[PDB]
Amino acid sequence: MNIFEMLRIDEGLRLKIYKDTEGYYTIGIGHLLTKSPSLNAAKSELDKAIGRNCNGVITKDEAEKLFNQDVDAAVRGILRNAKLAPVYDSLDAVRRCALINMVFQMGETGVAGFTNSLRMLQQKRWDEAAVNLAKSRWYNQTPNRAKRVITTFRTGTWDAYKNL
């Protein structure tokens, strides 16, 4: 298991523009296009991202390319972030993926707001962090996903993803 497989399971893959759980225009493997309620804005963002006239549809290779860009961006983003980098550096490999997962979903800003959970993770207080992590909108809005990521931080294993 690795971060790509992990996110591929959490985000799914759709080749046509679609609305994510928040009702935002998205495509491929969780690639957010825009927060605007406008589909044209979405299609425009799509063409710009891909570099051609897509009319709201992309190929699997195009999806995978965006995905490669998005994961790189997330890691790079974490590494650049004063609040996140130290946590990331403190973690083992599997748990690093769980952190990447959150940043991919909520953005570096959002995750950086989990101050308390972050301190806990840094301190390696797995159970306590897991409880804190669950007291969030994130958990209440996307519980199955949150549970998987949380279980990952708690255990340091892929068990939450094995069998999916």
Whose tokens are 């994961």? That residue is 71
Query: Residue from 31, 43, 95, 145 that binds Cl ion (CB under 5 A)?
Result: 145
Report the C-alpha gap between 50 and 46 in whole angstroms: 6
Under rule CB under 5 A, residue 135 binds Cl ion: yes
Under rule CB under 5 A, residue 141 binds Cl ion: no
Of 104, 32, 33, 99, which Cα lies nearest the Cα of 71?
Answer: 104
Q: How far is the CB of 21 from Cl ion (least distance, A)?
A: 7
Identity of the amino acid at 12: G
Flag whether 132 is marked binding.
Answer: yes
**What's the chain's length in residues?**
164
Q: How far is the CB of 24 from Cl ion (least distance, A)?
A: 16
Q: What is the size of the binding site for Cl ion (CB under 5 A)?
A: 4
Q: Which is nearer to Cl ion, 38 or 115 (CB)?
A: 115
Of 30, 35, 1, 25, which Cα lies nearest the Cα of 14?
Answer: 30
Q: Which is nearer to Cl ion, 96 or 147 (CB)?
A: 147
Supply 43's token pair: 């299609």
**19-37 exposure pattern, b = at least 16 Cβ within 10 A, e = fewer:** ebeeeebbbbbbbbbbeee
Flag whether 117 is marked binding.
Answer: yes
Query: Residue from 142, 149, 150, 152 that binds Cl ion (CB under 5 A)?
Result: 142
151 contacts 143 by C-beta, under 8 angstroms: no
Q: How far is the CB of 79 from Cl ion (least distance, A)?
A: 27
Flag whether 32 is marked binding.
Answer: yes
Q: What is the DSSP letter of 25?
A: E
Q: How far is the CB of 103 from Cl ion (least distance, A)?
A: 17
Q: Which is nearer to Cl ion, 80 or 135 (CB)?
A: 135
Q: What is the contact surface with Cl ion in residues (CB under 5 A)?
A: 135, 142, 144-145
Binding-site residues for substrate, please?
A: 32, 104, 117, 132
Which residues are identified as catalytic? 11, 20
